Amino acid sequence: HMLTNLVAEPFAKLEQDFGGSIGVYAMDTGSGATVSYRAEERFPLCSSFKGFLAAAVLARSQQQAGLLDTPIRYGKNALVPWSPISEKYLTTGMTVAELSAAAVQYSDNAAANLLLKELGGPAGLTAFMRSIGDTTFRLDRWELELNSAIPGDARDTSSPRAVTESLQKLTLGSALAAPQRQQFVDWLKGNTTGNHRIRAAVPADWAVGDKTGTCGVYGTANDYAVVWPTGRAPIVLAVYTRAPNKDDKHSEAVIAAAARLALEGLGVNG
Ligand SMILES: *[B@@-]1(O)O[C@H](CN)c2ccccc21
Structure with a gap:
C-alpha cells in the first residue's frame, strides 16, 4: 500500500470525459511503486x-521442441473476420510460430482460434494462466463471440492488475524459460496495432512491446505493455476501458492519455 498511488492523477476526470470507466495498473519493477485506478475491476479482454495465448504456446514449446516449427493447414471455414495474415496463407498453411506472431502482432483471429484449439480451448488458456498464479483471468469463448463485452458479464474478462502481474511474470520474471521469454518480448515489440495507445505515451527512444484489444461495442478497448525507459528498470502497465451503452465508441486517445498519467504517477520522465 505504502508505494501505491504516491502521487494522485486525474483518472476520474479522464473517464468522465470519455463517458465510461477506465482501469489502470502500472508497476515500476525497480522500486515496486504502483499506480492503480479501478485496478481490480473486471474488463473484457x-x-x-x-498475447497470453502466445505465451502459453511458448510455455508448451519448452516441452515440445518441434512445436513452433509445426506446419498448420486450415480451411476457408477457419478464416473469420479480421484475419489479415492467415488469409494470405490459406493455400499454403503457416507454422505455429507464425500463427502466434500473427495473433500477437496483427490480432489475427483465425490464428488465435487455431492456437486456442492447440491448447484445449478457452479452458486450456485459463489453466495456463492459473499455472502462473493468475486467479482472475478467465477465457470462456472463442473468436468472435468473446467480444460481446456485455455490462456485468464476467466471461472473457480480467482485471488491469492481474493483466499487469501476469505480463510481468511472463516478460521479466521466470514464468517462461529465458529463450521463450525473449521470444514473447520480441513478438510484443513487433506489434503493429498499438501505435495510438500506450506507445503514443512512450518516448521513441525507449523500447516497448504491447498487445491491444478492441471489442467493437460498449466503448470497450485496451492495451497492455512492457516499457524499457533508458537508465532505469522496466515498467509494466495495463489500461482497459468500457462504457455503458452498446454503441458507445472506444477511444485510442483516452488509452494513451491514461498511460501518460500512469507514467507521470510513477515519476517516470517522458
Ligand atoms: B481484437 O480486439 O483485435 C482485432 C482488431 N481491432 C479484432 C478484430 C475483430 C474482433 C476482435 C478483435
Missing part, C-alpha cells in the same frame, strides 16, 4: 488475450 477482447483481443488482448492473444
Whole structure:
C-alpha cells in the first residue's frame, strides 16, 4: 500500500470525459511503486488475450521442441473476420510460430482460434494462466463471440492488475524459460496495432512491446505493455476501458492519455 498511488492523477476526470470507466495498473519493477485506478475491476479482454495465448504456446514449446516449427493447414471455414495474415496463407498453411506472431502482432483471429484449439480451448488458456498464479483471468469463448463485452458479464474478462502481474511474470520474471521469454518480448515489440495507445505515451527512444484489444461495442478497448525507459528498470502497465451503452465508441486517445498519467504517477520522465 505504502508505494501505491504516491502521487494522485486525474483518472476520474479522464473517464468522465470519455463517458465510461477506465482501469489502470502500472508497476515500476525497480522500486515496486504502483499506480492503480479501478485496478481490480473486471474488463473484457477482447483481443488482448492473444498475447497470453502466445505465451502459453511458448510455455508448451519448452516441452515440445518441434512445436513452433509445426506446419498448420486450415480451411476457408477457419478464416473469420479480421484475419489479415492467415488469409494470405490459406493455400499454403503457416507454422505455429507464425500463427502466434500473427495473433500477437496483427490480432489475427483465425490464428488465435487455431492456437486456442492447440491448447484445449478457452479452458486450456485459463489453466495456463492459473499455472502462473493468475486467479482472475478467465477465457470462456472463442473468436468472435468473446467480444460481446456485455455490462456485468464476467466471461472473457480480467482485471488491469492481474493483466499487469501476469505480463510481468511472463516478460521479466521466470514464468517462461529465458529463450521463450525473449521470444514473447520480441513478438510484443513487433506489434503493429498499438501505435495510438500506450506507445503514443512512450518516448521513441525507449523500447516497448504491447498487445491491444478492441471489442467493437460498449466503448470497450485496451492495451497492455512492457516499457524499457533508458537508465532505469522496466515498467509494466495495463489500461482497459468500457462504457455503458452498446454503441458507445472506444477511444485510442483516452488509452494513451491514461498511460501518460500512469507514467507521470510513477515519476517516470517522458
Ligand atoms: B481484437 O480486439 O483485435 C482485432 C482488431 N481491432 C479484432 C478484430 C475483430 C474482433 C476482435 C478483435
